[PDB]
Amino acid sequence: SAIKPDMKIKLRMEGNVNGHHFVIDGDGTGKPFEGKQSMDLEVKEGGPLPFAFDILTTAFNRVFAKYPDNIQDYFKQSFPKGYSWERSLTFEDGGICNARNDITMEGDTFYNKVRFYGTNFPANGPVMQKKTLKWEPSTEKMYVRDGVLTGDVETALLLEGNAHYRCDFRTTYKAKEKGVKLPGAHFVDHCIEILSHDKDYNKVKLYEHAVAHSGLP
């Protein structure tokens, strides 16, 4: 295996939401075989961010997912050359984002070149008013569409005052190496949480646990 039980993560995100430019750096560690990762995120430019930090967090690597022997692990077989993804996020009030990640590996470290573009968020809505609390736990449906591995998520952010703000994500995943074999259809369960933050979310500790399964217990 190219992938060790303990891997480092290095990340830089550049992006723009509703006109607002920002740069965020990440440093972390994870256990690819246990499906667990944590990282320290630091806003380097454009802080304090004028929108809910939560919209960014699923952009901050499906290599960190526990895959059973009976599902093909496209992500771990992508290394060492790596893979990219592209994602469209569609929010219920017309907010739309496009995100991408190019993931590479050097020794014990995943490098992530992340881009995040958001537009059409209403000024009075929960994202620009900073009313989000968290992502609910989600299930990603993985399947092949016109020869491309595709993940669909139908999920929600919990808001202040017992309300939910619905989001649909579609992600396409592509290995850099031609002829990494596509998996069969399956599921990946996700739990993402902010573990700590400072006053304006200039520094955030992020955690994700993910487990691949076939729909049975």
Side-chain angles (χ1 to χ4, degrees):
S1 196
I3 300 185
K4 319 285 94 181
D6 305 285
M7 296 290 292
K8 300 191 183 167
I9 303 159
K10 298 293 180 173
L11 190 146
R12 175 157 285 195
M13 175 184 281
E14 317 192 354
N16 185 300
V17 168
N18 267 32
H20 304 280
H21 170 78
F22 58 86
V23 176
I24 305 166
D25 280 351
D27 187 292
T29 62
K31 290 178 195 288
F33 295 103
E34 296 176 46
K36 293 171 174 174
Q37 65 179 125
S38 77
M39 62 184 82
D40 296 290
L41 302 165
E42 190 184 342
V43 180
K44 289 299 178 64
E45 303 190 13
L49 292 187
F51 58 82
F53 198 89
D54 283 314
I55 65 163
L56 301 178
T57 55
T58 79
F60 294 122
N61 180 352
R62 205 74 51 262
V63 92
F64 298 103
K66 187 162 71 174
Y67 267 83
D69 297 326
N70 67 328
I71 306 171
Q72 162 80 343
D73 191 340
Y74 190 77
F75 305 105
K76 290 187 184 78
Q77 299 248 274
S78 294
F79 288 92
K81 281 198 186 136
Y83 78 100
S84 313
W85 56 252
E86 294 180 32
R87 185 173 300 158
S88 72
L89 295 86
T90 302
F91 293 91
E92 65 174 58
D93 61 357
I96 173 89
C97 317
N98 299 284
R100 57 188 188 260
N101 196 4
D102 302 309
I103 308 181
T104 54
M105 194 189 87
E106 304 291 350
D108 68 328
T109 298
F110 297 112
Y111 290 85
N112 300 257
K113 177 178 151 168
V114 192
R115 297 293 180 263
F116 191 101
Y117 303 114
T119 197
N120 227 49
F121 286 105
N124 59 2
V127 169
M128 300 306 298
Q129 290 298 323
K130 296 178 203 190
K131 308 301 286 182
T132 68
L133 289 186
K134 62 168 182 139
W135 293 95
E136 294 290 11
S138 70
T139 297
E140 186 173 13
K141 295 181 304 207
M142 296 291 210
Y143 61 89
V144 179
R145 185 199 209 97
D146 201 23
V148 178
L149 180 60
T150 304
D152 287 343
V153 184
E154 300 173 19
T155 187
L157 290 141
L158 179 68
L159 303 185
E160 275 181 46
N162 304 334
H164 277 100
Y165 175 59
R166 277 265 294 106
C167 191
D168 304 321
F169 314 163
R170 178 165 297 159
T171 311
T172 55
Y173 302 96
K174 299 189 180 218
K176 262 191 57 82
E177 208 156 69
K178 71 281 101 184
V180 180
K181 300 292 287 190
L182 295 170
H186 64 278
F187 302 99
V188 182
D189 283 357
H190 297 267
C191 194
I192 196 169
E193 295 183 31
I194 292 177
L195 292 187
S196 50
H197 64 96
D198 76 344
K199 177 177 145 192
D200 283 308
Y201 289 78
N202 287 308
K203 292 179 149 81
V204 170
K205 188 182 283 290
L206 191 64
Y207 177 81
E208 185 209 352
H209 183 223
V211 181
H213 62 87
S214 303
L216 296 170

